[PDB]
Amino acid sequence: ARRYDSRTTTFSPEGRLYQVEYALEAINNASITIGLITKDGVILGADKVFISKLIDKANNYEKIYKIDKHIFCGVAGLNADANILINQSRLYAQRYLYNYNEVQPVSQLVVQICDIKQSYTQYGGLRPYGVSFLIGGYDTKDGYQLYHTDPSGNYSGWFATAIGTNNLTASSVLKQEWKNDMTLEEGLLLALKTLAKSTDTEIPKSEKIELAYLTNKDGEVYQKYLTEKEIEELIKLYTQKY
Amino acid sequence: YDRGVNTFSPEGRLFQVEYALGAIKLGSTAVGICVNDGVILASERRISSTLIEKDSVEKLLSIDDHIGCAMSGLMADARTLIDYARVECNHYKFIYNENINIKSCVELISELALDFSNLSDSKRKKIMSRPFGVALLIGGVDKNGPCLWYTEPSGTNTRFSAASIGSAQEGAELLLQENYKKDMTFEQAEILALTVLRQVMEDKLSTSNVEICAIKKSDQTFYKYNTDDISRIIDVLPSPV
Amino acid sequence: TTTLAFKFKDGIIVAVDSRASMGSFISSQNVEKIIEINKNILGTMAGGAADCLYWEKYLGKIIKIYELRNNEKISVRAASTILSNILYQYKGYGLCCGIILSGYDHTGFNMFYVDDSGKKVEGNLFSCGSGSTYAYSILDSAYDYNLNLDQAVELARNAIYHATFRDGGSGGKVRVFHIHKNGYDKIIEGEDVFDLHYHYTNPEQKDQYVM
Amino acid sequence: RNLYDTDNIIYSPEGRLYQVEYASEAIKQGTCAVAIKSKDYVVVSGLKKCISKLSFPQEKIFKIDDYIGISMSGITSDAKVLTKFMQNECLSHKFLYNENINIESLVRSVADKYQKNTQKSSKRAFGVGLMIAAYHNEPCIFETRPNGSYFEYDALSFGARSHASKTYLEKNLHLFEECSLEELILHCLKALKCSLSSESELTISNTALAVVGKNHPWQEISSLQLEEYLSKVKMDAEQ
Amino acid sequence: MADGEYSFSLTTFSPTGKLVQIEYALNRVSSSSPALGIRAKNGVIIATEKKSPNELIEENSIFKIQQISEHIGIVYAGMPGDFRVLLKRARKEAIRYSLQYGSEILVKELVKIIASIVQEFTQTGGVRPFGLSLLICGVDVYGYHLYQIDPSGCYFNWMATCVGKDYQNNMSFLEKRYNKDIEIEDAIHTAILTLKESYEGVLNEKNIEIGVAYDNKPFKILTQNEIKDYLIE
Amino acid sequence: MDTLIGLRGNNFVVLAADTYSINSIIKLKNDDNTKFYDIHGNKCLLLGGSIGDRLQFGEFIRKNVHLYQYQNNTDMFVKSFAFFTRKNLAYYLRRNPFEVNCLIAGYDKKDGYQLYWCDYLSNMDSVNKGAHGYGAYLVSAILDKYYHENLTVDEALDIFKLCFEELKKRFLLTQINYELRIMYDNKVETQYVTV
Amino acid sequence: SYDRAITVFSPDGHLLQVEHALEAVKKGGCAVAIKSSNFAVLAVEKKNIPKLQNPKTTEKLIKLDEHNCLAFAGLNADARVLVNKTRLECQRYYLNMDEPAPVDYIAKYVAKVQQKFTHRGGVRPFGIATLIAGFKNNKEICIYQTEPSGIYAAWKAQAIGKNAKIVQEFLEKNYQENMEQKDCIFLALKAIFEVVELSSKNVEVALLTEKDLTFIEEQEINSMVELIDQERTKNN
Amino acid sequence: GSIYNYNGGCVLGMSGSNCVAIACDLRLGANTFTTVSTKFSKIFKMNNNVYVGLSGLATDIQTLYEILRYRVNLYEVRQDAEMDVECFANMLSSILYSNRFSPYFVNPIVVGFKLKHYKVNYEPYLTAYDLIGAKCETRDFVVNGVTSEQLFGMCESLYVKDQDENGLFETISQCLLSALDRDCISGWGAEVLVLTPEKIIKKKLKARMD
Ligand SMILES: O=C(NC1CCCC1)[C@@H]1CCCCOc2cccc(c2)C[C@H](N2CCCC2=O)C(=O)N[C@@H](CCN2CCOCC2)C(=O)N1
Ligand SMILES: O=C(NC1CCCC1)[C@@H]1CCCCOc2cccc(c2)C[C@H](N2CCCC2=O)C(=O)N[C@@H](CCN2CCOCC2)C(=O)N1
């Protein structure tokens, strides 16, 4: 039966892990997911992949997910693998709350999920998870945070970043336009700009945009998942400003 | 690769064991000499640079008070085997209140080395997934007097009066065969060991690139050689012609 | 049983009696209640004979393995921690162990008391066994850190003697070992307390002493 | 490429298990051993492999129990695992039943240990053969193979160039039954010598010899007795 | 076997990043008898093509539309044995939820649990993916739902959809005549018309199964006579 | 019995204990050091009960909290530390209980100076003042009577001195040797008191 | 549970998985550790996208316990898992001995873990090499270097990761004993910049003493970088 | 039995018209007679429509509250909605029974609103439990704790159907205070939470402190 083993967790002649490279190719083939930090909160935006006009576009976010009250993620890659890992990370946040009676710092949650991914790359004979996460949140220790994870269990903090297809264009737009002290509105307009420019267009379309942000206001951390109407308002504002 | 670890070749040899045999041919050369008054182990150290601390690296480890060991091949595997031997020798000493015979230590080491074969589930289960790729010289003094034993990845243990391991195994063995004598005294054993090492060492013999230990029959205590002892030996060496 | 140890200016004195009992019957008067854990650490046995012997020899094995593996001498504190953890793992099982670990290491002279309940107490003067209150009273009454070796040995002997005099569980011989920087010496291998009584309390030997 | 000799659980189109056959092939590479028996005695003789001039000869025969000993050919570590198993089975039988184990039952247990290592892809066959000599109501010699089969013999030999010893044994098989212990020892030693290399001899160093019989617990022969026997063999070989 | 060294993934990544086993399961689904579901104003309908191979087979013995609990129904396109296993698991999870929380399992929760079960079989060692797609319809406090579950374990929220044979053309036919404000009768007629346009020949009360959940009522599988009435027009 | 006392003010928290190590009817030591468990990051666990259980539970808590702080390169919040301690004690309560009473103190910017009172059953609450042991019966009313918010550190130490005098005078075990941990102004100080 | 032997002997007698892990290590950033009388300096290359990536998040130079630190080269995720195992072992040692773990003990433990991961079915080796600076039980400062095969040694100064040969040869002819803290920091900066672009933001530097681990400030690094640029231009 | 006397404490739930109230004493006892705390609330907010009152052994109170918070948070993040009060009540019953033979020594009550979504109607919801999860759904009042008999007498005598928020507050506060005044091991303060669909009013009563 060894003749059927594909040897997923085996080093390649160049110290590379081929399954991880292929999972990264799959992630690079997914729709764009962006994130950026303002002084008013973390913004996550995403392009929706069209399937049919019959999909139920009401209260159906499929690329941005709530992990906890103070944490939320964007997904790039295989959606079912992402669903598994999102369930796991929700469990991890609640476990930290159970054990310590306080909400989990964002970096600790990112570390736990990235450990899951690394373990799949090192132990066993199973394929890795084909998902990259943009995890953003707030906690008193480190303020507003934004992280990027890849299948290898790697991660890193960012002030703005993009994953998925054509992340180069979106990243260049963010590098040119992201500033160190932006307001929520400015952040949302910049997110709309980078989404529009990565999708090869000029005016973005509400039907294809998921936008959410996470603010710590008056002491409560609160997450807003913009509807098609709010996104339409922002699209009008963007077409005014450009 | 294509094969499994436990595969026989058409000539009835385990492929993995044979490949492991090709790994023991590497590393610094060590020589063991066992005469009636005590066993002596000598080894060259291949210091890689001036930045490496000589104290850290060492090819002559003590397994028990009365047992020393020289090693060759993969050093991490050798250290694993040596740690296991230390634990087992001390367990024997605890449950029997006496020093373990050297041959018994060699047997324990050889069984640990062959654990990868998965031949039987008795006592612990299989954990090692491959041979160790290590050859050892284990000398010591037990109730039967001094003795020098050799173990290798195939699990065969052989007793010698003098032996050699490492890169210059063959030249050192040639020098030992034609010079060793059974009635040699200890000082002559030291002279022979350092002469052989100097003859086969790429570098020039000196107190810093040679390590020595001996288990004398008088006290059955493994003893490491400091600089004065090595200098004393080096002085009485013959000419390098 | 009476064991004791104390620090003084030249090191550590360790003294014990040598009686072993099965109930009220004296099983032996030549048992050895000081056990060399290693070249620089001595252990004393109080309580269950099998428990003390087994777990102190087991500690000796552990320490031998440690000192081979790490090419250095273990500390008395580490040895006591290992022993206390091992014993605590048997809590509720009914082990009877009263142990004093004394030795020299790179932090100087050290002394710990370890019992089966997991207790681990650093200190400079300990006593264990049925006779330990008597040894304590004698030592505290006449203890000075600046005693010389002869005075320290004499005090240890006298304390053991008084313990064996008042305690039916202690007797036989007094052994007084001296721990110093380069190991330990047996100052008094074993001296019958019989002579000690007619030396200290009733030297006249002309009538029965009256408590 | 055979395409059928890679795994130990795969039959070839001819119905053969190649990995097990290779394990057997390992047996032919070992040093020669000879076992023969009279009506009261079994004598085992074998050549002790010597690695080099400064090396001590390898051990060829081993005591299992008071009246049981073995010789092996093949992978030494395998033989050691089997030796430990047999010694433990015998001692455990004495411990439980206060009697010496039945030799047939022990050999069957050994053969079942052999067999169990041939049915799973995660195992390999023991690459060693065991020659077993005991006295249990009668002298007996057994052989065990890597495939899990065992056989009883009246005279037996295996190892490198054991066909010459087998020729000698077949020739004189009729004699062994009625010959004395001294004669039986001479026969075993001569059969072993028949397997020697051209330049080699039989010396106290390189020759292992054990006897076991009716009132004769398994016992290796001492250097003095061994030397006298070897001298007698040489002298009556000159004839 | 199921443990030890013999537990390695049979679905692995290709150089382009695709998991071809999932694609092949998808092809297997796309070759199966069509199924579809429609979310109407006050109910949700799931309908399927059940073409009897021979006059000997008993139609009632084969139901491609099953009830998971009160108010939740399920239909599949693909391999029937896989469907049986997943239907048993879905019923088990419904009752597990019901035992914990007393009330009936919310459709979304069931769909997520089943999708995770499906996903496991694309990653765990020694197995193939499930070769089917599921349509799960139901009614709960939060309205009417129609969900699809793919062999990969992804799930989609639909107003109306079709899986199985030539589902692109069926999808165009269904999207040409679906509004969010249809009624139960209009939805059933639309489902029947879609299946007719797909099925080659003439449909009947024996060639189709239909299941409804409407007006806050328990899930119901239309009998032969009810479908016959729907087919009279 | 081991007497433990804790008092938190707006600007400080003070813990205090007797310094006796007891083996049956004799004092092994008059300067016990197995009660206070200083924890990196302005935290302190004070324990009473059997010495063996004290050592085991306290060193376990200290090591786990240090591990957390090294792994996450940050200081654990005092409240998180208190509830981690309580939860571990409650885990072992129904399996192999640690018969230990705890006072948990610390400072952090989020909550200021905090004091938690936890008993051997892992009943815990945050308090302004608390005590454990039989001497709690004799110090609790003094704590109540003389405590007020805005108390200064010197005033709190005078309150503790009142408590120590009462323990020496009226408690069956005449405790006269004490050790105090004072946390205030971003520094932890140790004091020893004889009455 | 997967149990296949991933690391096996090639016909040549090599553990090819170990050499591939070594390749991974050679793909990592450079790290340098220099020893002194009672302190060590550790430096490591930094890679960070300007104005978008956060520099404070990625940590190649980390603290194991009270007195031991670690730098590593190779796969970051492997490094994180190994580092967390090492911190756990540090605390376990403290619990079992009532003393903090010495540096040599921790180096031996890390090497044991790596060797073990070359010798167990169903796992691949760690693709990391590590530099471990800390104090022995005699309070002496030591630096150990471990590798994916599990072999370790103590060094007066060592570099790991990409282009480590150039840094090693540079350190051989420039390292002295008992250098002052300023000069040791400068030597570490020169060693790291022998193979990495000259810039303050391309290197992170820390200093290890008995007290604690202290990272050298940005302005100090920039001043030392200007000194290096001046010496380079003047040498050309 | 005596385990429940170790700490003391009690909880009380009451409903009015479009309002519901939950009240508890504030004492943390020890050894049945020593008061160690006077701010130990037995009332916990699961979500805006679900409160739980936990009397009994304080360690078990805290442990069970943490378990319930974990479960509710997981359920609500997965579902993206607030947990219905009845689902929560059944879940609490199942959690308590899962420890049927080594139970948590707790005497819970659940108080909140059952939402009937048409506009939304808010129906008061009350349930009292035993330690193994047996449930008592009620419309007027629920009680639990060592003070149960006194609370039962006060409620049976004083409860008035369909009271507005102020009448509800006065009634539940009087019931709690009168019951507490007859208990040696309960009291030392009372917190009263009066719930409406629009606001929550939290009050601390000037109660007896002996
Ligand atoms: O003197 C003693 N301690 C001193 C002497 C050395 C160290 C200090 C103790 C004094 C009482 C110890 C109580 O804790 C126990 C723990 C476990 C078991 C038992 C007792 C019961 C056991 N019993 C009772 C009758 C049958 C039997 O097995 C038993 O009392 N054993 C004797 C051993 C006496 N000798 C045995 C051989 O020779 C050396 C010593 C024994 O432990 N005495
Ligand atoms: O973080 C955890 N798991 C990590 C540790 C390993 C990997 C992950 C979970 C957290 C899950 C939270 C869900 O809510 C509960 C579910 C079931 C039971 C209980 C609570 C109550 C139970 N209680 C409360 C006090 C007495 C007792 O038994 C209890 O807390 N169980 C602990 C296990 C504790 N041990 C686990 C290993 O570590 C040492 C301690 C437990 O479930 N932890």
Side-chain angles (χ1 to χ4, degrees), chain C residues 77 84-85 88-89 91 113 115 117-127 132-133 136, chain F residues 21-23 25-29 32-34 50-53 55-57 96-99:
Chain C
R77 177 178 304 277
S84 77
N85 292 332
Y88 191 80
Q89 295 330 303
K91 207 185 73 158
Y113 172 58
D115 77 350
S117 87
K119 187 206 306 316
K120 181 185 104 209
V121 176
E122 194 191 354
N124 289 264
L125 187 142
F126 291 119
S127 196
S132 70
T133 64
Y136 261 126
Chain F
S21 282
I22 299 94
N23 194 27
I25 54 132
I26 76 103
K27 277 137 72 161
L28 285 171
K29 284 209 298 211
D32 172 87
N33 76 301
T34 61
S50 63
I51 287 163
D53 288 352
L55 283 155
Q56 296 286 321
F57 182 74
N96 188 45
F98 296 108
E99 337 308 326

Side-chain angles (χ1 to χ4, degrees), chain C residues 1 19-22 27 31 33 45-49 51 96:
Chain C
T1 282
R19 170 173 293 173
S21 56
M22 286 181 127
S27 158
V31 301
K33 290 177 199 202
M45 310 214 299
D51 300 328
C96 196

Side-chain angles (χ1 to χ4, degrees), chain C residues 1-3 17-23 27-28 31-33 44-53 94-97 169:
Chain C
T1 282
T2 311
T3 73
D17 75 303
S18 62
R19 170 173 293 173
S21 56
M22 286 181 127
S27 158
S28 148
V31 301
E32 303 277 355
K33 290 177 199 202
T44 64
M45 310 214 299
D51 300 328
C52 292
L53 197 279
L95 292 179
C96 196
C97 260

